[PDB]
Design a protein around this ligand. Structure first.
Ligand SMILES: *[C@@H]1O[C@H](CO)[C@@H](O)[C@H](O)[C@H]1NC(C)=O
Lengths: 111, 111
């Protein structure tokens, strides 16, 4: 419940949860991180659209999407096109992990 | 948890978990992925030491150490130094995601 692989989505009001941090993409577009329930950070895009959703792009970029797919917000950072993983940690940082480095099977090791 | 990040370590008996998948680094030193009871893959390092632990290097390398702190097994796939994340996914694959890409510090992007 605390990970979100690239191509996946956190629908409206859905959240990631790790330990005591809850990162929620609210329906009205503001991504909010709580700690035990009290807000502590937020993308400050409340009202910027509605039926909002958070998604991790295949190039590691993180973007909040409108229900009309407008790009409300975004981590504005992209690396090689591949597959990434956003993980909310038990310390509150929600991090995006570079493209895939290893995996079992035939090529599965970008070096 | 379904994530192990660089610097963390799973000791014997420990496992990541996700839905029906479970990746356990066993007392007998064998790193084994299961699906509901059934075994699907292993490093085949059973009885290759006891008290083994699975840790993820700072360079993304996945390694098994034993009783005497000797590398019993590894993935031998590493990249630049920083933080990595090994995540056991809902499709049952365990992937190790490249170095950190965006919250570099506050809001930093490795280019
Ligand atoms: C990879 O290296 C430095 C020293 O080699 C270490 O302090 C750091 O934890 C590492 N990764 C990062 C960026 O934390």
């Amino acid at each position: 419940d605390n990970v979100l692989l690239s191509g996946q989505t956190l629908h409206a009001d859905h959240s990631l949860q790790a330990g005591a941090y809850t990162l929620t993409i609210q329906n009205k577009c503001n991504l909010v991180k709580y700690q035990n329930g009290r807000q502590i950070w937020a993308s400050n895009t409340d009202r910027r659209g509605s039926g909002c959703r958070l998604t991790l792009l295949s190039d590691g970029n993180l973007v909040i999407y409108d229900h009309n797919n407008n790009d409300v917000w975004g981590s504005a950072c992209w690396g090689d096109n591949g597959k990434y993983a956003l993980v909310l940690q038990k310390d509150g940082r929600f991090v995006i992990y570079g493209p895939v480095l290893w995996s079992l099977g035939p090529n599965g090791c970008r070096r | 948890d379904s994530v192990l990040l660089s610097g963390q370590t799973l000791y014997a008996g420990h496992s990541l978990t996700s839905g029906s998948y479970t990746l356990t680094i066993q007392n007998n030193c064998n790193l084994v992925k299961y699906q509901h009871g059934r075994q699907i893959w292993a490093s085949d390092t059973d009885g290759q030491g006891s008290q083994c632990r699975l840790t993820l290097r700072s360079d993304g390398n996945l390694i098994i150490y034993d009783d005497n702190n000797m590398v019993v097994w590894g993935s031998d796939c590493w990249g630049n130094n920083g933080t990595y994340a090994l995540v056991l996914q809902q499709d049952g694959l365990f992937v190790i995601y490249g170095p950190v890409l965006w919250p570099l510090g506050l809001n930093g992007c490795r280019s």
